[PDB]
């Protein structure tokens, strides 16, 4: 059984066998340092006659007596210097600074509408698809971004995203929706009805998830509010990764984020990729504000907006060691890019959905694509239109491609109207060609995409064929 260098367990709480040792010795009321000196006299790891409490973690804790040590007393956690091997799961990430804090007793909030909802992610299999990816939600259920379905949380790597100010977690509160109990219930009633597996201690009930320890504050509008009473900080307010496989993931986060300023490095041309779009969304108050923000976006505006927050420095050119290299297309489902803003959640969903393509025409795929996009947000269509037609959008997501590509027949009609002054009968074979191309379904989505960009901001082989047809009239 592995402990830290203060002989507390992997979950941050003291061990029963150590409390019994110190109690028999009459050291229970002593300060932490005196208790540890005693334990060392008993040979530390081998102070128990039935255990070998190998020390895996190095932690710095308050002097508070051992029996009163909790995850809320930790200030620093990292791998123990002489421990050769991989670490077991630990409540906090390694190489992290730990901070600690009805709602008025926690945050300077004027009303619940000023609280921000944290982004909680779990790495797990989606039953609906078979894919394994980072699903976004809370500590009870999460949504699979590929298909939009909800799955119950399972054991695996977990993370909380970048901490917003006044961070809360909003959970469906069955105690309030159950009309027999309703709002104004007692605390005991909430925890008995919620049905989720909390960690019960003499000091209350808490939840350990994604590098934070949450506690219950209160309810509003039949939702329960939890707050990260304790949270890790590995750099730029990121809370790191905990759970199976977290050690490798943390190494990737620490290399990039644990700096005085996080270097955002745009490699090659500045294109509004999925990764850049969500980084900018992180700084937008609302989805509607983001729609206005992305209009006319270029590198300079991106640099100014991102750097204005103080935690980042934006540069461009060649890839650099230790920098946040953006330009090679990487998955947006990661502990990195775990932004908690409203606009960021919409952007993540838009660029992560897939289509159920089965020999369908472009017109059919567009109808399905719009249905998906409308479900995500009523601004999703205006947001995509802005990114595509007032900026320089690039993606390989089929839902976004299907929505835009299906409109090429209307854009072509208007484009030909603008060039030649009206719609001519001689130009019908160009529209008829597109209608036949729509029968290719997925096979034409990339070809149409390039055509839309060509006419949108007015040469690839798909456009050379189309353009040659137009030049016949």
The residue ranges that bind Zn ion (CB under 5 A) are 17, 48, 51, 126, 128-129, 144, 146-147, 173, 175-176, 219
Q: How far is the CB of 463 from Zn ion (least distance, A)?
A: 34
Where is the binding site for Zn(2+), in residues? 17, 48, 51, 53, 126, 129, 144, 147, 173, 176, 185, 219
**Which is closer to Zn ion, CB of 196 or CB of 411?**
196
**Strands, sheet with 120-125, edge to edge from the N-terminal-most edge strand:** 150-152, 141-143, 132-137, 120-125, 158-160, 241-242
**Which is closer to Zn ion, CB of 257 or CB of 373?**
373
CA distances from 233 to 57, 138, 248 (A): 17, 19, 17
- Give the distance, in angstroms, between the CA of residue 263 and the centroid of all CA atoms in the same chain: 19
Report yes or no: 416 and 423 within 8 Å, Cβ to Cβ.
yes
Q: Residue 393 carries which DSSP code?
A: B
* Cα–Cα dist 307/469, whole Å: 47
Q: How far is the CB of 16 from Zn ion (least distance, A)?
A: 8
Residue 358 backbone dihedrals phi, psi, to 5 degrees: -145, 80
Decide the pairing of beta strands 55-61 and 141-143.
unpaired
Burial (Cβ within 10 Å: 0-12, 13-18, ≥19) of residue 419: exposed
Q: How far is the CB of 299 from Zn ion (least distance, A)?
A: 35
Q: How far is the CB of 150 from Zn ion (least distance, A)?
A: 10
Q: How far is the CB of 467 from Zn ion (least distance, A)?
A: 39
**Which is closer to Zn ion, CB of 146 or CB of 299?**
146
**Which is closer to Zn ion, CB of 190 or CB of 415?**
190
Where is the binding site, in residues? 17, 48, 51, 53, 126, 129, 144, 147, 173, 176, 185, 219
**Which is closer to Zn ion, CB of 129 or CB of 267?**
129
**Which is closer to Zn ion, CB of 54 or CB of 155?**
54
Q: How far is the CB of 387 from Zn ion (least distance, A)?
A: 25
Alpha helices (runs of H) in 377-397, residue ranges in sequence order: 380-389
> What number of other Cβ atoms are within 10 A of residue 49's Cβ?
6
């Amino acid at each position: 059984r592995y402990v830290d260098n203060n002989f507390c367990g992997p979950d941050g709480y003291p061990l029963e066998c150590i409390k019994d040792l110190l109690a028999r010795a009459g050291k229970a009321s002593c300060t932490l340092s005196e208790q540890l000196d005693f334990i060392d006299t008993k040979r530390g790891v081998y102070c128990c006659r039935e255990h070998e409490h190998e020390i895996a973690w190095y932690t710095e804790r308050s002097e508070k007596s051992y029996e009163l040590q909790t995850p809320f007393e930790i200030k620093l956690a990292k791998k123990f210097d002489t421990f050769n091997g991989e670490c077991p799961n630990f409540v906090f990430p390694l190489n992290s600074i730990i901070k600690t804090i009805r709602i008025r007793s926690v945050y300077p909030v004027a009303s619940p509408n000023e609280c921000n909802q944290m982004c909680l992610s779990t790495l797990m299999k989606c039953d609906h698809c078979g894919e394994t990816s980072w699903q976004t939600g809370d500590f009870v259920k999460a949504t699979c971004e590929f298909c939009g379905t909800e799955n119950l949380t399972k054991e695996g790597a977990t993370t909380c995203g970048y901490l917003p100010q006044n961070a809360v977690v909003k959970i469906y509160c069955p105690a309030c929706h159950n009309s027999e109990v309703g709002p104004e219930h007692s605390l005991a009633e909430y925890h008995n009805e919620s049905g989720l597996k909390t960690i019960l201690r003499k000091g209350g009930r808490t939840i350990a998830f994604g590098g934070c320890v949450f506690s219950y504050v209160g309810c509003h509008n039949k939702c329960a509010y939890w707050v990260p009473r304790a949270s890790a900080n590995i750099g730029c307010n990121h809370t790191g990764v905990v759970g199976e496989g977290s050690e490798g993931l943390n190494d990737n986060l620490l290399e990039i984020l644990q700096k005085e300023k996080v270097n955002i490095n745009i490699v090659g041309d500045f294109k509004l990729n999925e990764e850049i779009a969500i980084i900018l969304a992180s700084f937008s108050a609302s989805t509607s504000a983001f729609v206005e923000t992305v209009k006319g976006l270029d590198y300079k505006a991106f640099k100014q907006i991102v750097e204005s927050c103080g935690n980042f420095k934006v540069t461009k050119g060649k890839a650099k060691k230790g920098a946040w290299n953006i330009g090679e297309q990487k998955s947006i489902l990661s502990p990195l890019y775990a932004f908690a803003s409203e606009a960021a959640r919409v952007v993540r969903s838009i660029f992560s959905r897939t289509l159920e393509t089965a020999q369908n025409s472009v017109r059919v795929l567009q109808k399905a694509a719009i249905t998906i996009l409308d479900g995500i947000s009523q601004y999703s269509l205006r947001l995509i239109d802005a990114m595509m037609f007032t900026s320089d959008l690039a993606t390989n997501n089929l839902v976004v491609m299907a929505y835009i590509t299906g409109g090429v027949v209307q854009l072509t009609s208007q484009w030909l109207t603008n060039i030649f002054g009206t719609v001519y009968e001689k130009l019908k074979p160009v529209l008829d060609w597109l209608e036949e191309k729509f029968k290719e379904g997925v096979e034409f989505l990339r070809d149409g995409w390039e055509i839309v960009k060509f006419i949108s901001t007015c040469i690839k082989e798909s456009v050379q064929t189309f353009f040659k047809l137009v030049n016949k009239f």
